[PDB]
Ligand binder design. Structure first.
Ligand code: HEM
Ligand code: HEM
Ligand code: OS7
Ligand code: OS7
Ligand code: H4B
Ligand code: H4B
Ligand code: ZN
Lengths: 411, 411
């Protein structure tokens, strides 16, 4: 059963067979589309089919499907599951799985890069201090003095769900947020709740507008522990504008390394609850969302004010005009400091080339239009005009609840 | 099964029950989301028609608070007898107006629906000829235009009978600009209308072969060959496009028309199919300034505008496209406002839609909404609709797509 997607700007039509390999559910039905909904322990009963499916995919990809090595590995995993109730991936399988979870991430526009992921095996880690060390090395490797390198660090898998490894931070590097008694917020409003937890755990907050949060790390189900990333490892970029000299005086900076640390990596039915991964920024993530969301730093006002635009009526498009300038400044600053960044024109064009290649070589590329189209200038990027099919493939990155809502405190 | 939608900027959560009354299908399944597919998809037989009529009359009589009343049961019986007899049935004027207003109310891709109950419905079911169609359409255009104070309207021509006697407006909009492919290979005028512009010429029309030539109407009554008519120019309100800061802007020679009037859709009420039902409102500025002017497959003016602005067009990371895009859309709103022609900017329209959504959830239990179409094609995330989860589902009465008549017409 073939399915076609059309690019309405170029009339290129692509045919998707890969969706037939899709198992998990989308949230949609024949009668409702949940395409804009943000968020729509395993027993050995269901674990071996998940392992077998993954291992068939793995051995197919290495052109050894049905081989003796393939059949012996299936045997070995089968015996390990009934004996021990779980199983361990080989290093080769772990690397394959992590790369393919990125390849399958339908909301990620950066997937042309999926095969160049640096995978750090942290499954021998046992303590929060051990986690801190692995994360420091990840941050140093990925940052590479501004020449950013994609990487993932994979901590031990879930066992009984009572011994999880978790990074309580949503990203490895993020700025604190403080609610003031007068109702205003200092710093990043998105991080107020997590900041409060850190402070309660003993963090001494400097209470500034761009304070790097401490790492809050949980090993083996124990209470989490606070660690401060060495500041020499945290690369930051002061934001200035190439024509507007007053822009630097707004006091803005951002960190160079985007490293998401709250998602769950699923490979062959195994669940890796701590698996921070990092690449590099698309400019709009900072310039549109981080700076200009009303619920974030929300700087459209001051920027438009210092630009002296007509702010009395929205039909002057003063918001749109300040938005472009802020995003110019983000890109200019990162390029000037030689820190890797990509603009949304380049990134969406690369994605279209990636997508067509995946249709040719793989039979499809699952893609979430709602997330792939950039949050400014949508229709002047090529993905806007591109029809896309969204479906769930494994290996995958999944959401998981924030640990402070489920953790059982040891005290 | 009583679904919730969250606004992530305001944490406002609405509960949707209206979707459980959904009739038709979305194109999605639990295995695949087709939310970004443009078109996800002979007469009604005697059996299919009556349930459709019953469902519609049930909701009509509920709306006037006469569900289960004398008049309700009598109308149910009356239509029931007429279908058994004539194999179709005729709507009363009151039901026709209700059906048209609720087709708009149910149009999940329309951001302008806060206005849905203030629709002027012109009953043209007594029409028999293309000359008569032309007359009704001129009256529509003049009424809707209202010397620049635009008024929403629909004109409804006779309903499909056996599919051989169809009324159709061959134009996609009542007012659109011609498109000609040039000798050197480029395109003069509107490329989206090149095929239609040539059906008009290859049928009788003689073209000024300019850049903004108003197309003639191609009107089909009762299944006959369509006929060409020129709309009186005094009835076509146009706006010369200038910029409030850039005096060279007028030298680009751009204009657009004031009246957006879609004429190629099919209106479904109680199973009856109205294949000719042109409807009109007023423009959101981005429809002209982002899509009509800046799509690469349309007038595609971004290069020339940025050149006159002397922006650095050598790299995409200068965001020269984004900067020009904003200025172009500033000029469109400025020109319409200057000439006192109704227009709405994308900030005002999306704020109105959020208010409408709240109204519909409160008074009706929900509002079907297609995020992919509701979010404007520029500055997406600084409009409130970007952060609003939406549920998309199909309610009837409805506007539907239908094939272009030249691919169908028994010529
Ligand atoms: C290399 C450059 C990369 C770029 C430019 C990039 C870009 C993006 C962007 C812009 C988003 C949308 C997020 C948002 O708007 O908040 C996203 C989502 C995502 N990225 Fe990438 N990314 C990159 C690398 C990676 C890597 C290395 C991984 C994992 C190994 C990854 C996994 C994901 C996932 C799983 C999502 C979706 C999260 C969800 O489902 O909600 N990305 N990416
Ligand atoms: C009064 C001001 C109105 C505004 C500002 C408005 C705005 C819009 C916009 C921006 C779109 C997206 C279409 C595109 O991007 O090409 C749209 C779609 C649509 N509008 Fe409205 N509209 C208005 C009135 C109306 C009226 C009066 C009707 C019918 C009586 C209507 C029915 C529709 C339909 C049926 C669609 C698309 C449905 C589809 O493609 O499936 N609109 N509208
Ligand atoms: C490796 C990499 C590079 C790069 N440039 N960007 C990346 C963005 C993400 C990513 C994913 C999901 C997100 O969603 C938050 C949410 C979801 C649901 C509900 C509420 N909030 C966010 C927002 N922080 C970011 C992940 C990795 C990235
Ligand atoms: C009343 C009113 C006012 C207003 N301001 N804008 C309106 C826009 C539309 C409307 C809907 C669907 C469309 O379809 C795109 C398409 C789909 C599939 C294939 C090709 N193209 C188009 C463009 N043709 C326009 C309808 C009514 C409007
Ligand atoms: C409600 C809506 O789904 C939500 O705001 C989404 C829209 N698209 C997005 N797209 C990206 N890339 N990132 C986001 O956070 C969101 N948020
Ligand atoms: C491929 C994609 O579905 C297509 O480009 C859609 C996307 N969103 C849109 N949104 C609106 N309002 N109008 C459109 O024509 C489109 N086109
Ligand atoms: Zn869907």
């Amino acid at each position: 059963r073939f399915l076609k997607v059309k690019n309405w700007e170029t009339d290129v039509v692509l045919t998707d067979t890969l969706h037939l390999k899709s198992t998990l559910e989308t949230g949609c039905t024949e009668h409702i589309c949940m395409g804009s909904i943000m968020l729509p322990v395993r027993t050995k009963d269901q674990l071996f089919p998940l392992a077998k499916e993954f291992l068939d995919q793995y051995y197919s990809s290495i052109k050894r499907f049905g081989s003796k090595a393939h059949m012996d590995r299936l045997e070995e995993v089968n015996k390990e599951i009934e004996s021990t109730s779980t199983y361990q991936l080989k290093d080769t399988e772990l690397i394959y799985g992590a790369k393919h979870a990125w390849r399958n991430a339908s909301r990620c526009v950066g997937r042309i890069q999926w095969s160049k992921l640096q995978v750090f095996d942290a499954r021998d880690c046992t303590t929060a201090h051990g986690m801190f060390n692995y994360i420091c090395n990840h941050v140093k490797y990925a940052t590479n003095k501004g020449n950013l390198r994609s990487a993932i660090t994979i901590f031990p898998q879930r066992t009984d769900g009572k011994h999880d490894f978790r990074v309580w931070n949503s990203q490895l590097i993020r700025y604190a947020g403080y609610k003031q008694p007068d109702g205003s917020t200092l710093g990043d409003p998105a991080n107020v709740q997590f900041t409060e937890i850190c402070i309660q755990q003993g963090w001494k907050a400097p209470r500034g507008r761009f304070d790097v949060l401490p790492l809050l790390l949980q090993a083996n189900g124990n209470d989490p522990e606070l660690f401060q990333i060495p500041p020499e490892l945290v690369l930051e970029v002061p934001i200035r504008h190439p024509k507007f000299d007053w822009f630097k005086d707004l006091g803005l900076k951002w960190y160079g390394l985007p490293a998401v640390s709250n998602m769950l990596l699923e490979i062959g039915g195994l669940e890796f609850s701590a698996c921070p991964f990092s690449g590099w920024y698309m400019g709009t993530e900072i310039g549109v969302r981080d700076y200009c969301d009303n619920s974030r730093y929300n700087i459209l006002e001051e920027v438009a004010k210092k630009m002296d635009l007509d702010m009395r009526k929205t039909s002057s498009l003063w918001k749109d005009q300040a938005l472009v300038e802020i995003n110019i400044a983000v890109l200019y600053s990162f390029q000037s400091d030689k820190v890797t960044i990509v603009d949304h024109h380049s990134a969406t064009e690369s994605f279209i080339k990636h997508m067509e290649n995946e249709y040719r070589c793989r039979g499809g590329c699952p893609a979430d239009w709602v997330w792939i189209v950039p949050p400014m200038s949508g229709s002047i990027t090529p993905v806007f005009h591109q029809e896309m099919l969204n479906y769930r493939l494994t290996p995958s990155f999944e959401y998981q609840p924030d640990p402070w809502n489920t953790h059982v405190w040891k005290g």
